Design a protein around this ligand. Structure first.
Ligand code: NA
Ligand SMILES: [Zn+2]
Ligand SMILES: [Zn+2]
Lengths: 259, 259
């Protein structure tokens, strides 16, 4: 089948072959230069309403692991900030490194974090995720850096189930997970127009990247590295370095909600 | 689950529900008003090079039947006219009516023909059809009107095989078919920027519609009406009136190659 990954032959440098938008004008991630990002005090506070979030399952898709939510109603939504309308949470996933010193997709003054959490939301005025991804204003991804440090209690339920989804295609029931437990205390953010960071690389994302990282323990992130990109009974290829490097900003402006 | 067709409930008037681009700026087909479509002397001579065309198979896809070609090399190409680049023939198909007085998608001064032949080509530079459909210059469709009259010898080979592809999903081998035999003597044409005339209605088509129809006998076109939209063992729904009506021109200009 058509496929892609993060290896020498199928990795980010080659994605352009099947997905020519890889060289587009609004690609993600980007490096955030804190001295040139533009303060915009017209940006509203972000409203994160996750009180009724309903997680369903966790799965290994061969590129990362997703925790999927019931997005049939407004149970977990993002509003405000730079957004117009209501964006419903569909899933979250991470990108991470082979070493603590790398793994994030966005960087801040070229600094890489150990991992990056993406909470993926779609604009309810398009009716479903499939329609939303084909629109410039279809998705809002909230990106949250993970810095190695203190353990994050809220991540532990995720870590504890990874052994049941080791290889590509494995899934497991994953109910009653509270995504509020992955948020930092400050909701100060950068924002810019961009894309999905994996194929098909669609330019449909309003990026909202939080200034404040969450901590996770060296042991928590190590558990991510023990997942496999490959399927069961295939040669073991550890799921590490599933990040796209920073792409050119081109004519875009990154805005900060804070000075 | 998603379905479209040509019935009262799933037909062209409802396509916009799942495919909002149905109400876009460059939709097809259109009515060609011969009093306002003007000669454009910047148009280049149209080159149809089909001497090495290699047909492979014929199939009923539940919406029409397609004759598919080997598009791995430049064996059957369209160049010149309004096009920049070389466009490879991938398939042809028709749209037709329940009666001889209707069936074309394009109309000329509001006149409908009994059917319309679409020769579908994609721009080599995009590597394959799938990539090409996502670009405004991806496809070139040569459209040829079928007027009921004398039998067309060049169509007979197609007619003769239809009893082997009666239902959706059936296919048959269809080698050595010469698509030059479906062309009229004049390559005078009208051209405008438009779309696929079926879902997903992507706005990736340079239309080239020939002035001169080819003749089809009443019996030849009758055979098209004995095909079935449905699969084998499903209720019989005869494959007729699989045409989209003319859409608004909006801000486009239709150019003529001839004075
Ligand atoms: Na007219
Ligand atoms: Zn991501
Ligand atoms: Zn057609």
């Amino acid at each position: 089948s058509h496929h892609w990954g993060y290896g020498k032959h199928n990795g980010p440098e080659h994605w352009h072959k099947d997905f020519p938008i890889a060289k587009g004008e609004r690609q993600s991630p980007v490096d955030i230069d804190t001295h040139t990002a533009k303060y915009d005090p017209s940006l509203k506070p972000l409203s994160v309403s996750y009180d009724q979030a309903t997680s369903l399952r966790i799965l290994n898709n061969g590129h990362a692991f997703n925790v999927e939510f019931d997005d049939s109603q407004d149970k977990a939504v993002l509003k405000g900030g730079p957004l117009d309308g209501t964006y419903r949470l569909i899933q979250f996933h991470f990108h991470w490194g082979s070493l603590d010193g790398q793994g994030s997709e966005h960087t801040v003054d070229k600094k890489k974090y150990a991992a990056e959490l993406h909470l993926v939301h779609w604009n309810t005025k398009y009716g479903d995720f499939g329609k939303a991804v084909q629109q410039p204003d279809g998705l809002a991804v909230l990106g949250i850096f993970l810095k190695v440090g203190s353990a994050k209690p809220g991540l532990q339920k995720v870590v504890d189930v990874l052994d049941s989804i080791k290889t590509k295609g494995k899934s497991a029931d994953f109910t009653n997970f509270d995504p509020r437990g992955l948020l930092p205390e400050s909701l100060d953010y950068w924002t810019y127009p961009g894309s999905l960071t994996t194929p098909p690389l669609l330019e449909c994302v309003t990026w909202i990247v939080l200034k404040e990282p969450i901590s996770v323990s060296s042991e928590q992130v190590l558990k991510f590295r023990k997942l496999n990109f490959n399927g069961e009974g295939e040669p073991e290829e550890l799921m590490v370095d599933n990040w796209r490097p920073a792409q050119p900003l081109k004519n875009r402006q990154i805005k900060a909600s804070f000075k």
